[PDB]
Amino acid sequence: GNSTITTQEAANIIVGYGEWPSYCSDSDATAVDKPTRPDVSVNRFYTLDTKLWEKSSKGWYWKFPDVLTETGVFGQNAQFHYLYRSGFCIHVQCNASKFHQGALLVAVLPEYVIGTVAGGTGTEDSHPPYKQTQPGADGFELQHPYVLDAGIPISQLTVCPHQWINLRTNNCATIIVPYINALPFDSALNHCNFGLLVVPISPLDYDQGATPVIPITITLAPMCSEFAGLR
Amino acid sequence: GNSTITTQEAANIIVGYGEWPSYCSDSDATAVDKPTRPDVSVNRFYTLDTKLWEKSSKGWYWKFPDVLTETGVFGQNAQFHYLYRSGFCIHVQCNASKFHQGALLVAVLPEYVIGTVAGGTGTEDSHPPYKQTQPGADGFELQHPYVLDAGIPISQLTVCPHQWINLRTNNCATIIVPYINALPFDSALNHCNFGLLVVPISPLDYDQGATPVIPITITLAPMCSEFAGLR
Amino acid sequence: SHSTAETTLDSFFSRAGLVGEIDLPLEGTTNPNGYANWDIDITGYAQMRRKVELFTYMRFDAEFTFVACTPTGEVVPQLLQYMFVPPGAPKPDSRESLAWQTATNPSVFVKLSDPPAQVSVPFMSPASAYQWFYDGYPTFGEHKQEKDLEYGACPNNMMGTFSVRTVGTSKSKYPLVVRIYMRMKHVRAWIPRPMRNQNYLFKANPNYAGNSIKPTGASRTAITTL
Amino acid sequence: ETILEVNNVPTNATSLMERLRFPVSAQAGKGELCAVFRADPGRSGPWQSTLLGQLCGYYTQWSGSLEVTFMFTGSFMATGKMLIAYTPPGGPLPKDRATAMLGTHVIWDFGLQSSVTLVIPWISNTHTTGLVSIWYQTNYVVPIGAPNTAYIIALAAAQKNFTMQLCKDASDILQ
Known part of the structure; x- marks a missing residue:
């Protein structure tokens, strides 16, 4: 941790599926290749940036690990290596005034396969572009949110690991996510293991004050990263 | 308590006269038939309703046990029965903003014999109507406040059991009242054993905000009820 | 008490x-x-x-x-x-x-x-489990436009093919129809997802009718009516 | 726990998201009825938004206790008390707030508890539904510069004593 900022942390922490991230056992590691375990250098607190929440906004999503694939040592140690394995520590911080009000749904959904409009009837056998499906650092903004842009209702999204951000109670959510995939090792650039989801359910509002845009900061850091083949 | 909404209990509680409500011992109770002690079903938290406090309001008062005589099981176990005994647990709740201001005097006055105007000179040997003397659940609004509508100065009311509600410190009053009467057992409909008094002393005020009316919720529940004659 | 046997995956x-x-x-x-x-x-x-x-x-x-x-x-x-x-x-x-x-x-x-x-067929995937969702691409490279059809397709869920014959050599003497019935055995499931709420548009692709989005359940005239 | 769509407005397909939230505003008044829904998940339709309700769609008969967690999404400065009342199968919704009191009910404040949770004692399917009613105990109190309108999210789920009993299949097409 290059900058631990105390947020008066409490039992807000939410283990993904009750499984703390762990290194692949070498009996589990179906390889005689030396698995590169990259200590602290990449385990640092990577803070993506800030997105501006306004009452018209619909939501945002990231794709792990595509978010960080071009973001620092972790990024370079992912593009270069052939096999990748890791967990994460998601700290979505939304700090707003005591006079603001709202609710975000920070949630993590494994294998967030995106479905986008193919035509209002489905006139096209279309398919979402490299941009939309692997947005990376900027993150991508949802267009249809009731359906999670995947023929999937958000009303039950909370069946996934999730942390509420009600502006009257908390300003910080803390989700840690273990590596989840059929294979112990998959590609880093190609198989986005899971997706971070944060959607304003109860929309923001205010008497017209001096600030109309609430920040949503996502800080995150790998837990037990792991790489194998080199370049 | 069917819905104890924790307000984090505090030393606002005020024993009547250092006398906790108690069942009348039958050595004290001049009766040989078994006195009906009506379990929890009637000890439930009766919440009258909410009165809207506005800066022109002068005060309100209720009459025990006239408040509940027609409101639920307790009312039914009083109108039917001939003799009645009980205490009460008064929980006056006033929830307002931190920008509002005012001060209430929640007070309990035994035998609140009401006096009404006899004429601007005193033209009438009049006597107050069934409504005013027994307003019941809805409650009655004071007309003359400095005098407690009984030739009686409110400036000394605090000699009665009382709890202040300053909006900068507290939002809740909690008075418990033991049965106080010359007789151990009296009628429920005819002798209003005492009266609840809640009068704004330091008046409400505000620069024109978004709320001009502060609510006053009154919850109450009997303590040591006791009934005798049947129908 | 009762039994949670029919709410098990196998019963389901x-x-x-x-x-x-x-x-x-x-x-x-x-x-x-x-x-x-x-x-x-x-x-x-x-x-x-x-x-x-x-x-x-x-x-x-x-x-x-x-x-x-x-x-x-x-x-x-x-x-x-x-x-x-x-x-x-x-x-x-x-x-x-x-x-x-x-x-x-x-x-x-x-x-x-x-x-x-x-006849019974064992689990066939090279992977440890079937995936109904592969949020990404299966190949290891390139940039070409028509890579999009590859998106969301997992080949590892290839269980095989059934071929029906007559038999030969000369063609049949009868009009035939064969019905194939599949029952699952030894079911193990994992990551749970919210259940599909929009009509399907394609196969191996979770698209949805963009102009005709219906709400998940029925609706009513007002919030305070029955 | 999953989100319970109590609010129903389909025509506004662009903003179907309104279905997840209560409107509660200062233009209301004491005893005014905020919202009301039934306490049977298998039937359409406010429970159909729940993961529970649609799993039940795959089953025929069932029985158990339910719990509905309400979460208040207003500002820190907003206050006001609301009455949630349960009225068991048989017998209609209470005429007014007072008559909701005599039955099992819950006095909910936004001041102290941002999230209150109601337990539905028992509902079986031996073949009316039961009835959850939410009332305005008080005014909606808000200072200057604070929103006159806020929203509530309802989260519902069943408890471990819940069982589904007979298998059925639903209504969603292929291709």
Whole structure:
């Protein structure tokens, strides 16, 4: 941790599926290749940036690990290596005034396969572009949110690991996510293991004050990263 | 308590006269038939309703046990029965903003014999109507406040059991009242054993905000009820 | 107390549903040469896709049963052949192909007069479990435009193919239809997802009708009415 | 726990998201009825938004206790008390707030508890539904510069004593 900022942390922490991230056992590691375990250098607190929440906004999503694939040592140690394995520590911080009000749904959904409009009837056998499906650092903004842009209702999204951000109670959510995939090792650039989801359910509002845009900061850091083949 | 909404209990509680409500011992109770002690079903938290406090309001008062005589099981176990005994647990709740201001005097006055105007000179040997003397659940609004509508100065009311509600410190009053009467057992409909008094002393005020009316919720529940004659 | 046996995955899945209808007429374009290759999918039992998409990763054995008959339901003295083509193995291109004799792909020889053919198929994926969702791309490179059809496609869920014959050499004397029934066995599921709420548009692709988005459930006239 | 769509407005397909939230505003008044829904998940339709309700769609008969967690999404400065009342099968919704009191009810404040949770004692399916009613105990109190309108999210789920009993299949197409 290059900058631990105390947020008066409490039992807000939410283990993904009750499984703390762990290194692949070498009996589990179906390889005689030396698995590169990259200590602290990449385990640092990577803070993506800030997105501006306004009452018209619909939501945002990231794709792990595509978010960080071009973001620092972790990024370079992912593009270069052939096999990748890791967990994460998601700290979505939304700090707003005591006079603001709202609710975000920070949630993590494994294998967030995106479905986008193919035509209002489905006139096209279309398919979402490299941009939309692997947005990376900027993150991508949802267009249809009731359906999670995947023929999937958000009303039950909370069946996934999730942390509420009600502006009257908390300003910080803390989700840690273990590596989840059929294979112990998959590609880093190609198989986005899971997706971070944060959607304003109860929309923001205010008497017209001096600030109309609430920040949503996502800080995150790998837990037990792991790489194998080199370049 | 069917819905104890924790307000984090505090030393606002005020024993009547250092006398906790108690069942009348039958050595004290001049009766040989078994006195009906009506379990929890009637000890439930009766919440009258909410009165809207506005800066022109002068005060309100209720009459025990006239408040509940027609409101639920307790009312039914009083109108039917001939003799009645009980205490009460008064929980006056006033929830307002931190920008509002005012001060209430929640007070309990035994035998609140009401006096009404006899004429601007005193033209009438009049006597107050069934409504005013027994307003019941809805409650009655004071007309003359400095005098407690009984030739009686409110400036000394605090000699009665009382709890202040300053909006900068507290939002809740909690008075418990033991049965106080010359007789151990009296009628429920005819002798209003005492009266609840809640009068704004330091008046409400505000620069024109978004709320001009502060609510006053009154919850109450009997303590040591006791009934005798049947129908 | 009661029992949570029917709310188990096996009770929820272990019922054989119709997954394949194969028409074998004597004249028509439907099946001219007389053979059909049926790529296995756990759909067909249409109501299965929503169920099976409750989870992300799944694992199971499969039991296939083969009911054969004429369109009248008449049983006729025909000797059919059900041949199973495992993944990767070459599928038959025509009735005279050597694949029908290539005994690396198991094949069942049943008469239509005999009761339905039955046989069990083990878990076939190279992966540790089936995926109904592969949020990404399967290849390891390139940038070309038509890579989008590859998006969301996991080949590892290739369970194989069933091929039906007459048998040869000369064409049948009877109009035939075979029904394939699939029942799951030893079901293990994993990552649970919110259940599908919009009508399906494609296969192996979770698209939704963009202009016609209906809410998940029925609606009412006002919030305070019954 | 999953989100309970109590609010129903489909025509506004662009903003179907309104279905997840209560409107509660200062233009209301004491005893005014905020919202009301039934306490049977298998039937359409406010429970159909729940993961529970649609799983039940795959089953025929069932029985158990339910719990509905309400979460207040207003500002820190907003206050006001709301009455949630349960009225068991048989017998209609109470005429007014007072008559909701005599039955099992819950006095909910936004001041102290941002999230209150109601337990539905028992509902079986031996073949009316039961009835959850939410009332305005008080005014909606808000200072200057604070929103006169806020929203509530309802989260519902069943408890471990819940069982589904007979298997059925639903209504969603292929292709």
